[PDB]
Amino acid sequence: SLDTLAAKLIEKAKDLRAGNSTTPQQHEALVGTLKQVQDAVYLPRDDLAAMQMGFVTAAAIRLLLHWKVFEKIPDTGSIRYEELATQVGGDVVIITRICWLLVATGFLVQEGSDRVAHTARTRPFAGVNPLRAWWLMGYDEYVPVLLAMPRYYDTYGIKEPTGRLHTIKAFTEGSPELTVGEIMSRHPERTANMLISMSAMASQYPHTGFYDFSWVAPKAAESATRPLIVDIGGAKGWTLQAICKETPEIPISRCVLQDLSGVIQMVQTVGDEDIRSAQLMAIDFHKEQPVQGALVYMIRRILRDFGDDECVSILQHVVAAMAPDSKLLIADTVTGNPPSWFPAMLDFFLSTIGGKERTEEEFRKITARAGLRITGIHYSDKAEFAMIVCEKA
Amino acid sequence: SLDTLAAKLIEKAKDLRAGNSTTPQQHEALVGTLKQVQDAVYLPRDDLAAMQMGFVTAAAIRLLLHWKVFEKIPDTGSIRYEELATQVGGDVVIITRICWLLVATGFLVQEGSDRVAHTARTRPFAGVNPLRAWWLMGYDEYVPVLLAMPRYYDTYGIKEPTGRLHTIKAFTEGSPELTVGEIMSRHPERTANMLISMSAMASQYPHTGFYDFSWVAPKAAESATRPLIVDIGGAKGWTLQAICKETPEIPISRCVLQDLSGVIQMVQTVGDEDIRSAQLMAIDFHKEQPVQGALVYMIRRILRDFGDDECVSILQHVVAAMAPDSKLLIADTVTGNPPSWFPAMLDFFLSTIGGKERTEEEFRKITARAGLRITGIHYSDKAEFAMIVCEKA
Ligand SMILES: Nc1ncnc2c1ncn2[C@@H]1O[C@H](CSCC[C@H](N)C(=O)O)[C@@H](O)[C@H]1O
Numbered sequence: 054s055l056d057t058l059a060a061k062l063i064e065k066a067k068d069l070r071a072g073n074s075t076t077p078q079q080h081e082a083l084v085g086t087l088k089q090v091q092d093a094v095y096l097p098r099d100d101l102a103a104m105q106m107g108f109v110t111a112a113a114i115r116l117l118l119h120w121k122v123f124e125k126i127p128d129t130g131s132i133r134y135e136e137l138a139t140q141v142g143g144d145v146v147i148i149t150r151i152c153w154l155l156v157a158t159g160f161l162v163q164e165g166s167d168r169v170a171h172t173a174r175t176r177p178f179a180g181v182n183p184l185r186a187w188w189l190m191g192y193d194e195y196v197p198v199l200l201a202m203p204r205y206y207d208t209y210g211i212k213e214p215t216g217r218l219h220t221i222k223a224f225t226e227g228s229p230e231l232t233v234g235e236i237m238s239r240h241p242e243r244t245a246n247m248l249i250s251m252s253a254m255a256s257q258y259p260h261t262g263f264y265d266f267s268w269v270a271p272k273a274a275e276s277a278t279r280p281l282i283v284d285i286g287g288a289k290g291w292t293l294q295a296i297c298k299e300t301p302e303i304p305i306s307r308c309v310l311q312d313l314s315g316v317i318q319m320v321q322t323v324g325d326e327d328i329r330s331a332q333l334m335a336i337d338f339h340k341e342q343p344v345q346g347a348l349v350y351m352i353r354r355i356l357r358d359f360g361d362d363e364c365v366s367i368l369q370h371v372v373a374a375m376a377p378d379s380k381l382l383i384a385d386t387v388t389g390n391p392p393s394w395f396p397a398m399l400d401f402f403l404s405t406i407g408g409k410e411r412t413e414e415e416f417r418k419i420t421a422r423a424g425l426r427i428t429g430i431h432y433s434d435k436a437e438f439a440m441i442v443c444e445k446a
Numbered sequence: 447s448l449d450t451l452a453a454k455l456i457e458k459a460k461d462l463r464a465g466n467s468t469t470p471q472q473h474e475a476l477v478g479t480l481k482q483v484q485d486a487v488y489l490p491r492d493d494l495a496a497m498q499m500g501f502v503t504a505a506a507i508r509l510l511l512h513w514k515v516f517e518k519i520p521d522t523g524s525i526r527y528e529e530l531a532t533q534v535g536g537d538v539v540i541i542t543r544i545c546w547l548l549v550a551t552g553f554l555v556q557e558g559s560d561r562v563a564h565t566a567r568t569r570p571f572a573g574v575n576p577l578r579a580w581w582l583m584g585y586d587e588y589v590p591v592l593l594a595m596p597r598y599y600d601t602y603g604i605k606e607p608t609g610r611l612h613t614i615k616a617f618t619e620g621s622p623e624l625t626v627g628e629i630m631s632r633h634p635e636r637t638a639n640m641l642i643s644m645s646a647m648a649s650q651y652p653h654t655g656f657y658d659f660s661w662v663a664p665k666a667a668e669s670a671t672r673p674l675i676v677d678i679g680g681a682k683g684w685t686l687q688a689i690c691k692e693t694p695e696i697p698i699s700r701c702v703l704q705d706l707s708g709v710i711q712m713v714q715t716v717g718d719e720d721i722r723s724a725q726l727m728a729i730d731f732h733k734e735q736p737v738q739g740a741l742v743y744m745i746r747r748i749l750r751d752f753g754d755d756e757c758v759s760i761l762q763h764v765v766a767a768m769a770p771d772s773k774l775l776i777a778d779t780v781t782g783n784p785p786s787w788f789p790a791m792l793d794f795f796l797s798t799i800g801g802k803e804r805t806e807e808e809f810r811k812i813t814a815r816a817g818l819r820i821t822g823i824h825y826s827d828k829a830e831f832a833m834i835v836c837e838k839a
């Protein structure tokens with residue numbers, strides 16, 4: 054309410070006067086209450102004007118990024134607009150007008166009428182760091198695809214986008230007949246930033262803590278030879294390392310990391326001593342599962358990138374390798390009906406490449422097509438991210 | 447400070463509890479305080495999340511609008527996603543996934559597992575109305591232009607765009623020979639939407655209530671043909687209708703509604719009997735004012751669309767048509783320095799069409815260059831909006 058929002062501000066202001074910085078918990082509670090109060094107070098004209106302001110504050114940030122303006126405003130203190138314009142090589146009037154938008158929305162501050170300064174909200178834009186790369190990748194790569202969606206569905210019909218061909222992304226790029234991978238292969242720099250981005254995306258999901266792997270240990274004692282955990286598309290093997298650190302009774306040397314050859318060779322050359330103790334295999338999980346009869350096959354944050362038919366193809370190759378008692382674990386969001394905001398947004402972004410976040414019933418459909426039955430679903434603390442446990446039907 | 451902000455929230459809360467209802471001014475003030483709270487507590491990750499939520503929500507709204515979903519969701523009650531999908535002729539799965547984005551933020555409500563309902567936030571999208579038209583103008587006609595700004599300034603240099611030709615909008619449209627008004631005026635559905643949007647946001651752009659016209663009604667008696675008010679670029683004459691309703695002794699038949707040929711022809715097709723009884727007239731105000739000796743020439747929300755020199759040239763044509771007792775009235779946004787929140791947003795948008803928001807002093811310098819003397823400036827008490835009353839120097 055208005056009063057409880059006031060109470061959280063009074064508390065913040067008092068605690069700062071006491072040299073006690075804000076808790077992350079305290080911060081999320083304050084911004085959540087603000088949003089609640091805004092949703093209660095704002096009328097539709099306020100909602101829509103706030104949305105339009107969001108477009109122009111992002112466009113202003115993008116333009117000042119392009120002009121290298123945030124780098125020229127010093128981390129502390131200020132710079133005169135005239136001096137900023139000289140260093141940029143442009144007209145002080147237009148540079149000032151763009152800065153004034155960000156002054157009016159609290160991103161920058163003016164010291165007098167003559168000078169401009171960073172705030173905490175703009176310092177991440179003044180140099181190299183993951184937030185600035187994440188920001189630029191969302192803006193440059195996704196906003197035009199979002200704007201192209203009405204035209205996309207005009208062309209293809211109001212139908213769920215499911216293939217690796219004719220994606221919204223590739224359509225936006227002008228090459229719907231190519232895969233996003235064929236398109237990105239012609240764009241070195243953008244391929245570099247797409248690799249930065251989705252490695253940062255996997256940083257946000259827990260590797261362990263919500264699923265008990267210890268049932269592997271008695272199987273590992275009964276059999277000295279059976280492969281234990283096969284990580285299909287496991288990137289640099291960090292999930293396997295975390296699992297085996299968590300349960301030392303699972304020898305990483307009896308686990309298998311599968312990925313693309315370029316990923317495996319850099320694991321062979323730079324990864325830790327434990328991940329190099331594992332069996333490392335270049336594979337194409339669209340075509341093959343080479344390890345036969347392992348206790349566990351794990352597919353983590355992969356199926357979300359693909360439509361139902363491509364997922365069933367991936368799963369059927371694994372099922373063919375499974376022994377009757379093997380488990381296939383899918384680590385992904387089991388999105389709710391209706392979904393919470395973060396998975397709902399991620400699902401919208403996945404629609405541009407042919408993927409989606411699946412409900413429990415949708416996961417049951419594709420696992421059954423592949424000859425599997427879901428026997429448990431174990432949820433993490435994060436946004437319905439879960440371990441789906443499957444056995445042969 | 448946080449403490450003065452909390453204080454304002456608390457006193458707002460008390461009046462509501464105490465029975466007194468929120469006046470329009472108090473609503474605008476509370477929204478302003480909530481924005482100040484946002485600027486004071488948001489961190490970069492909150493800004494990134496808000497940018498992403500705004501862009502995704504806008505794209506979901508635009509798609510569901512384009513698909514006629516909001517039209518098919520009943521005004522109250524709920525409708526099954528399957529019925530909705532059948533009625534719009536689309537796949538229930540992709541329609542649900544998009545609705546789920548709006549459900550997650552509270553724009554739509556989901557009932558049970560399979561029904562969806564409007565809220566007050568989405569009913570504006572269900573049919574044609576001024577607020578929806580304002581939002582569509584921003585989103586369809588300007589958001590793609592924001593994305594062209596870096597290329598535009600790489601093409602023409604980092605300098606304030608002040609020309610009526612080669613605007614960023616015309617650059618994006620591919621029509622270097624045309625002003626923005628001409629571009630819009632050549633497409634019937636874009637024109638129709640623009641006309642409807644001119645009644646929106648009366649909270650920023652009031653049509654009556656800040657300037658007294660009753661002095662015109664005596665002058666009406668002094669002649670039978672003398673034009674009383676000439677509405678230069680008056681769109682569909684909404685402002686003339688509002689003036690003539692407020693002062694019934696100004697007959698609309700003695701008023702002239704002027705606009706581009708494509709706009710004025712559409713006004714003929716969609717206008718009611720009242721405006722069709724005025725004198726409609728195609729003009730080009732960059733080159734002419736063809737009505738000589740009218741009592742009042744009104745120039746409402748025109749000068750904001752053009753740069754200084756162009757505004758002087760437009761005003762000069764009108765000055766040349768004025769009789770000695772004529773008045774030239776400029777109705778427009780008048781903001782401070784730096785601009786307030788809403789004019790700051792519009793100033794950034796207007797840079798794409800060669801215009802800007804202005805202070806009172808900036809307007810005084812332009813009227814002086816045009817040979818006008820300002821005899822009064824009558825501000826709205828609810829908006830940064832004024833009537834600037836002028837006569838020949
Ligand atoms: N056809 C293919 N065969 C094997 N691996 C592939 C593949 N296509 C993509 N990959 C790999 O699959 C991974 C998807 S990102 C998922 C990584 C990891 N499972 C996690 O915890 O998030 C990438 O590392 C990529 O290199």
Ligand SMILES: Nc1ncnc2c1ncn2[C@@H]1O[C@H](CSCC[C@H](N)C(=O)O)[C@@H](O)[C@H]1O
Pocket residue numbers: 625627628631644645678679680681682684685704705706709729730731732746747748
């Ligand atoms: N060269 C020109 N000659 C006449 N009208 C023009 C014009 N260029 C733009 N316009 C008109 O200027 C108007 C700007 S929008 C302002 C409309 C109205 N006076 C109001 O305040 O509600 C539009 O209707 C547009 O069609």
